[PDB]
Amino acid sequence: NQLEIERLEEQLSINVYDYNCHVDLIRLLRLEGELTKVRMARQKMSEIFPLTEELWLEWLHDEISMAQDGLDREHVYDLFEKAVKDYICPNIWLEYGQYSVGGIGQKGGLEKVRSVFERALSSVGLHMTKGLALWEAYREFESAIVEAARLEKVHSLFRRQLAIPLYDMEATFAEYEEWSEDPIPESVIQNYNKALQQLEKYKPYEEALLQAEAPRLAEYQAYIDFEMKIGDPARIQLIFERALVENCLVPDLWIRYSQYLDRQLKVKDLVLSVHNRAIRNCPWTVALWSRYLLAMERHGVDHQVISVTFEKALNAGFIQATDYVEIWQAYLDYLRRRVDFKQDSSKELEELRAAFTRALEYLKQEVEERFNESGDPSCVIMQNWARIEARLCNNMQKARELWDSIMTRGNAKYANMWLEYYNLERAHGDTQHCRKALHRAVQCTSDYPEHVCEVLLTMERTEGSLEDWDIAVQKTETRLARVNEQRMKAAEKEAALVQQEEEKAEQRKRARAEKKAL
Amino acid sequence: NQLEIERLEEQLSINVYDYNCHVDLIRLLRLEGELTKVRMARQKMSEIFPLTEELWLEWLHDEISMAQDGLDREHVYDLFEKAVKDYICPNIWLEYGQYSVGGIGQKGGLEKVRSVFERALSSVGLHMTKGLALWEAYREFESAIVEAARLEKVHSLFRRQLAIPLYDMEATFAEYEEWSEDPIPESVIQNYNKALQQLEKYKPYEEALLQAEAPRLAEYQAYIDFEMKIGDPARIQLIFERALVENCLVPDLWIRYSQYLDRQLKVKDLVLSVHNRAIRNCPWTVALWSRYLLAMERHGVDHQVISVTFEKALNAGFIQATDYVEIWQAYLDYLRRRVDFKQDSSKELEELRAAFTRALEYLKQEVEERFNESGDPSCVIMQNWARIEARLCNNMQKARELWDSIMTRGNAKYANMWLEYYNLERAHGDTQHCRKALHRAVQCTSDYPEHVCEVLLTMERTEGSLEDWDIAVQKTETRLARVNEQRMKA
Secondary structure, eight states: OHHHHHHHHHHHHHOTTOHHHHHHHHHHHHHHTOHHHHHHHHHHHHTTSOOOHHHHHHHHHHHHHHOOSHHHHHHHHHHHHHHHHHSOOHHHHHHHHHHHGGGBTBTTHHHHHHHHHHHHHHHHTTOTTTSHHHHHHHHHHHHHHOSSSTHHHHHHHHHHHHTSOOTTHHHHHHHHHHHOSSOOOHHHHHHHHHHHHHHHHHHHHHHHHHHSOSSOHHHHHHHHHHHHHHTOHHHHHHHHHHHHHHOTTOHHHHHHHHHHIIIIIOOHHHHHHHHHHHHHHOTTOHHHHHHHHHHHHHTTOOHHHHHHHHHHHHTTOOSOHHHHHHHHHHHHHHHHTTOOTTSSOOHHHHHHHHHHHHHHHHIIIIIHHHHSSOSOTTOHHHHHHHHHHHHTSSOHHHHHHHHHHHHHTTTTTOHHHHHHHHHHHHHHSOHHHHHHHHHHHHHHOOSOHHHHHHHHHHHHHHHOOHHHHHHHHHHHHHHHHHHHHHHHHHHHHHHHHHHHHHHHHHHHHHTOOSSOOO | OHHHHHHHHHHHHHOTTOHHHHHHHHHHHHHHTOHHHHHHHHHHHHTTSOOOHHHHHHHHHHHHHSOOTTTTHHHHHHHHHHHHHHSOOHHHHHHHHHHHGGGTTSTTHHHHHHHHHHHHHHHHTTOTTTSHHHHHHHHHHHHHHOSSSTHHHHHHHHHHHHTSOOTTOHHHHHHHHHHOSSOOOHHHHHHHHHHHHHHHHHHHHHHHHHHSOTTOHHHHHHHHHHHHHHTOHHHHHHHHHHHHHHOTTOHHHHHHHHHHIIIIIOOHHHHHHHHHHHHHHOTTOHHHHHHHHHHHHHTTOOHHHHHHHHHHHHTTOOSOHHHHHHHHHHHHHHHHTTOOTTOSSOHHHHHHHHHHHHHHHHIIIIIHHHHSSOSOTTOHHHHHHHHHHHHTSSOHHHHHHHHHHHIIIIITTOHHHHHHHHHHHHHHSOHHHHHHHHHHHHHHOOSSHHHHHHHHHHHHHHHSOHHHHHHHHHHHHHHHHHHHHHHHHO
16 A cells, blocks of 8 residues: 555656645545644645645544644644635534634633634625525524523524525524514514515526536626626625635636726735635736736735745746746836836836846746747837836936847837837937938838838928938838839739739640540 | 901900910911010910920011111020020021021120030030031031131031031031041041940930820830930930920929939039929929929028919919928928027027918918818828927927817827827827826727727836826726727617
8 A cells, every 4th residue: 555655655746736646645645544644745735736625624624533632723723724715615614613612611712713603704604505504503602601691692693694695594584583582673574574685686696506517607607797786895705706616717707806806895915815816726827927916016015025926926837928028027017116216226226127137038048948939029028128218217328229139130120110219219319319210210111111201201301401301202212112113023923923823724724625534 | 367366365364374375366466467466475475384496486587587677686686595495496596596697797796606506505416316407507607707727616516526426427527537638536536436336326216216106205204214324414414305395294204304403413503494494384283393492492592582482382273182281391391491499589480480370371261262171181280380399499388289279170089190199298298298198099099999098008007106007907998898889889
């Protein structure tokens, strides 16, 4: 049996991203009874993958069976704390509540049990199908500690629940009437009726969810669309989380959720936790990383931790080269917003300039090596560096050095490219340099040459000397003449190929053998 | 017969630009013998139109026949002076020389005869077909005056002529050996040989010209192409002038000719005579006026005469609305190059700002009434004014006033209009004004809204705060969502 464990152990050392291998290794260590090794393998899997409810539960059950010390109780609590983070988990919460009851009597045991049930209810108390079990477990505990006056607390739990649309809530209203010696107040009956109307209202979606199987993403989306029209922040979070349990590998769903959080709730601890979980579920999508870095910046996360997050993004592994420029650009935009441009020379500015160099080299080395295509064809990073360096810093010279480099890459043929450079020179350079840029455009542009000529003639018309206008008409006339010659000649060749294909089709008319022997 | 004459005179009182009517009025007046009325009709026509050689000759014969030796010889000369101006005219020149011989007895009569023959030879002495008659008339005059020493003058003319390729040139070489007691020198004979080589070169072209029916425009162009390959300035002008005799109504031919003069020769007096002569033949073409104003500026013609030349163009009459903005464009460019922008007074700059205003109004009133279009749909004059006013003068507020007006006239829906405005603000305004322009652009752009959004987003990403970026995505998302709602609706 140990032979097979060693096989799995080495298979993980070659590739640690084999989820099923981790699962197989743990099941075997657990069988062999290696207790410190199972926990070690479980801590190592959990740091890499978010774990499903069933995997957390077996781990929780195992630590609980062996906890034999008051300290191990504390350790089990720490584990429960880890488990609730990955996805919504009504059974884990229920297990946490029931377990925490065992520490009653100790200094904070009564308060602790109330703390976890209350936390459970905030997370899963509105859950149509699995929320009810939590309310019932909470009430049962409260009634078990008191006989005559804490009764107000048990009342409150009955009243809190009956204002919420849950399944079999009807049996809970009846259970409450019998229990209560005091009459059920009119306000409670009205909150219950409105909760029943909500229950009838959400019933078709819950049923569509039930009849559909499985992950039932389309039915989840319809539900989410519905809850957003209604607009209860608490219900919208719930329905997102419910959907994300079965569809955690659908990045657009994470985007949708995090986007709602980033625009509406705007609660730091919540939005960032959700971004992080998106990252653990779908590391391969760059938008998730760039949106994470955005959220960290909006909420004043320390620069060091934002930076270390970015470094993790570079190591996630993406499928496209374009993906790597996107992550670099998000980080670069972030570094750019940290600089005070009102004053040269900022330490932050040198950090920015250092980052740009690093990005271009990273694009030159790592991405080019793996994909064998540059990840930035139109050199958009260099363009941004150039724009910044010329408009925000008084360093037009660096902008020029950059642009000469952008153009050498066969980018010299694009009208829009020359114009991007021209406009940069028109704003922060001199007229002499616009003219040289424009004279170059005319010489090099291959897609829309008439366009760049018009731009050159317009500049000379408005700002140049008569010699300048005359040189401009000469260069443009000459250039356009050459263009029209090749355009016209190539049309001669296509017309010549059509005539060759007509004389080929000609021989086929005069040679039509209706009978074939071969 | 006089009846048809009264009809033509009133038709001219109605419209003075009827060339054939003028020709007909003159034909009847000449025939009817109204000696005083013909001189008038001829003078009033010649000031408007260039006259063909035959029309100048007939006028000249009448004045010479009415020798009214009061004396009109100086006056007849003045007429010849007018006649040589219009086109190349070997018969008018030949006619001028034979006539000038009659005044040889008078003071400096001799220098005058040599003056016109030399002037004639400079214009048409290289003419393959008609140049020879002038060389022969010059020699004939020269051999006729002295016995022993002007014999040299005649020698120089035989030699001068024999170095130039003419038709029937061989018979003049043979004619020279007999007349000349001394042998024909080796240098003269080799220049003759290369000229015979020149005669062979031009022979297929001279003949191709001969076989086609007049104006033989296609055949003339081939010749011009050929002579330009050779690149001899004297020879190039000739073939142009020759072609222009028959094709004076082909503006494209004048353009190539005047263009050759402006790029290659660059001699003030020569280029300006051909440009002036071009507008008189084809006034309806705006390029001819515009190239003319350029040439006057290149050659430093007085500011006052350029303005009157320009004012003349406005009354010429064009077929397109675009033509009127083009001439207006040309004049505005000219006035701008007269301005020193380092000096803010500025005397020239005030004529310029005044000129723009006058121009925009001409398009609103005169051009709009006739065409019911501005002729400047995208407002490039206002665009140019704004650009000048913002980059060269520190008057950015004026550029904005101009741009507001452009957007007001239905250009707010075009992305390129907003971006051009954005780019001006980006260069000579502040960032807050770029932000406002773009925000306006996103709301209004109707043709390519997705594009202007990309431009706003790029800006915020590169210069804006994180909140600025965030506002931009909302504005763009909302705008694009609504746009997409309409393409499904419609």
